[PDB]
Design a protein around this ligand. Structure first.
Ligand SMILES: Cc1c(C(=O)C2=C(O)CCCC2=O)ccc2c1c(=O)n(CC#C[Si](C)(C)C)c(=O)n2C
Ligand SMILES: Cc1c(C(=O)C2=C(O)CCCC2=O)ccc2c1c(=O)n(CC#C[Si](C)(C)C)c(=O)n2C
Ligand SMILES: [Co+2]
Ligand SMILES: [Co+2]
Lengths: 382, 382
């Protein structure tokens, strides 16, 4: 059931902003590891004395990396005279966020029809305001409300090129990397209590609920279900410790857990990312045992051929299935020092109408299949 | 003249420690950009609840990248029960250093005969103590004194593998990158006043002075002149603004300006680094005009053949010459967000006895030759 109860007009995921200690080094690592091009900048060379911000793109996926300069460079500015290109930025907020959480996502940005109206409706319906609507060069409007922890949901609306004050990046420093990633599929939060978190977000957006493992979870979705916001809470006192609880402890509370990036060819994406894992890119979780891939034939043998199942095994890809579609997924090890944020690469098969969002689910069924698969241990014991 | 006045026995440069916001992302970027292997770690997986530290190596060059975890993970520890592998580390010091200076060098570490004796003699001769001698597993001793700004000179001595508590890195995550870099040649500080800085450091080490451009500089050297510590001060009120003064402003005061890394084949190093500049590695300063390389024949045509001079032009390499040797050098753009720290790649020709340290100088003569070379403008004007 989709009651289409969005309280304002939501278009698509727009960008994700990481708050960094040094934006240059994180952006360069992510660019090489994920195959994202340098496409825009706002920094000292563009007249920004407040923060350094670098934009990477791959298809419609936009990753923004921002770090503060010395407050001394902008000591004489006030908000009416600021050189910052992102008006919500604050030196103290950014340093406090990073000191408290380490490297991670500050902003989940969605494009809306009217960011001022989205902000107003959201706050009227319970959203805690974070940054009021600011109109940039009479062209772009940006506003922010609190989502969970110190993560904000950022609204952006365009009258008619990322943000004013950003410059397109010099061709020489913009190598056209591309490993196949095309857009953000979903963005997932970890919280101590799922119930109140869902009630708060669903309350102010009108997003509806989208149709033993250490977690309980639920997914909020926009009218066309292309903006997907799962939220997890821990399940305490199990056999092994909950990964959600470990996250909360190492992150100092709620925050963004993972970003799921849709690829238009997950085989190529994973080949390219895995070649770079040990030369500056990203590491992947340990692959499932061969029994997992033998079990794939019975589960998805009508969707994937033997060779494609063999290719999944070569690359460590997980496979799950809905009553409507199929999901190919894999998870990176944490992106930084702390066992907190990580990335999921995904590709979805089915639900052709365009492909409907969330086709195939989120891989909940792979918790059971992975554990059952560990029966490779019992088979090796023989 | 070398009066060999070292007040304790100094061996060689041992390592350089960067204080980071996220050690993982900086270390991975540097590894790919410079061709340095992951060789040791101290982090949550080794039982360190205090800091994440990752060691990169290339030949005898050792770069250490350290960042603090949440203080909450180690809240119950005291120094007698710490899980930190580097006893001088402090969460508050590290966060304050990074918030104030951005990414940069915290420690210039030299190997000595006896770090406890080196520390004692140094402080008796005016050194401001930073961290007292600590003996690790009855095997390694480490002590620190203030060098300039918030940079420390760290002494390490070995009874007889980086530091106890560090684990050698798994072969799988240790790709054997190597672009030819072999050791640290010199480490350079920027300070507001050169005179007092030299007097302070030379006072407590006994290091001797080693034999219009916006700076005054001088070089302190150990007995065998293999530990080389240049220091710069700005020269105010010129035509263009002093790069030393820009550094001090953006760094919030004195700090490490550049690290000069000796290559055993600067042509190969620069080929490899330049191929990676726009896919996650390091950028280089703009190359000198062709007139610079035409002028090379008269200056060094007895040392470098035409083809080798052409290879320098292809790679943007600078060349200077002493009365004793020749220097090939090139400079990266700043390593992080701020126009502060950068890297020099160098290779020295001559002074064969082994090669004596500092053979060929530090390239002071290239300030004049670069400006004179800008006569390409007058030639193009014709
Ligand atoms: C993160 C994730 C998802 C997922 O994407 C998802 C959502 O999008 C919304 C719903 C809830 C949720 O979880 C799905 C499957 C996963 C993982 C994952 O992270 N891992 C890694 C480990 C482990 Si361990 C060693 C602590 C037992 C998996 O194995 N599977 C199988
Ligand atoms: C850093 C450096 C050195 C150097 O290593 C050195 C020492 O080791 C100890 C002594 C003092 C010192 O300087 C030498 C030459 C250099 C540079 C440099 O940084 N640059 C870059 C710019 C510039 Si601009 C656009 C602001 C005029 C050079 O061009 N040359 C030519
Ligand atoms: Co997911
Ligand atoms: Co130098």
């Amino acid at each position: 059931k989709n009651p289409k109860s969005d309280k304002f007009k939501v278009k698509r995921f727009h960008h994700i902003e990481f708050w960094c200690g040094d934006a240059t080094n994180v952006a360069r690592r992510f660019s090489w590891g994920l195959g994202m091009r340098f496409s825009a900048k706002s920094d000292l060379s563009t007249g920004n004395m407040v923060h350094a911000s670098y934009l990477l793109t791959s298809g419609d996926l936009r990753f923004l990396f921002t770090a503060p300069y010395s407050p001394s460079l902008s000591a004489g500015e006030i908000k009416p005279t600021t050189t910052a290109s992102i008006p919500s930025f604050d030196h103290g907020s950014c340093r406090s966020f990073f000191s408290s959480h380490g490297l991670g996502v500050r902003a989940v940005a969605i494009e809306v029809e009217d960011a001022e109206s989205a902000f107003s409706i959201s706050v009227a319906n319970g959203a805690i305001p974070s940054s009021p609507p600011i109109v940039l060069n009479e062209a772009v409007t940006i506003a922010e409300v609190k989502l969970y922890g110190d993560v904000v949901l950022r609204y952006v609306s365009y009258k008619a090129e990322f943000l004013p004050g950003f410059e397109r990046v010099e061709d020489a420093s913009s190598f056209p990397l591309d490993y196949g990633i095309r857009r953000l599929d979903h963005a997932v939060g970890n919280v101590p209590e799922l119930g109140p978190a869902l009630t708060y977000v669903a309350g102010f957006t009108g997003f509806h609920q989208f149709a033993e493992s250490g977690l309980n979870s639920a997914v909020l979705a926009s009218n066309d279900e292309m903006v997907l916001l799962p939220i997890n809470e821990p399940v305490h006192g199990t056999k092994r410790k909950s990964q959600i609880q470990t996250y909360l402890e190492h992150n100092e509370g709620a925050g963004l857990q993972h970003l799921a990036l849709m690829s238009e060819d997950i085989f190529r994406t994973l080949r390219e990312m895995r070649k770079r894992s040990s030369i500056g890119g990203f590491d992947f979780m340990p692959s499932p045992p061969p029994t997992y891939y033998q079990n794939l034939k019975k589960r998805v043998g009508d969707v994937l051929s033997d060779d494609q199942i063999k290719e999944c095994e070569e690359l460590g890809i997980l496979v799950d299935r809905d009553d409507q579609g199929t999901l190919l997924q894999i998870f990176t090890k944490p992106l930084g020092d702390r066992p907190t944020i990580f990335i999921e690469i995904i590709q979805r098969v089915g639900c052709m109408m365009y492909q409907s969002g969330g086709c195939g689910g989120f891989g909940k069924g792979n918790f059971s299949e992975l554990f059952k698969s560990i029966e490779e241990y019992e088979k090796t014991l023989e």
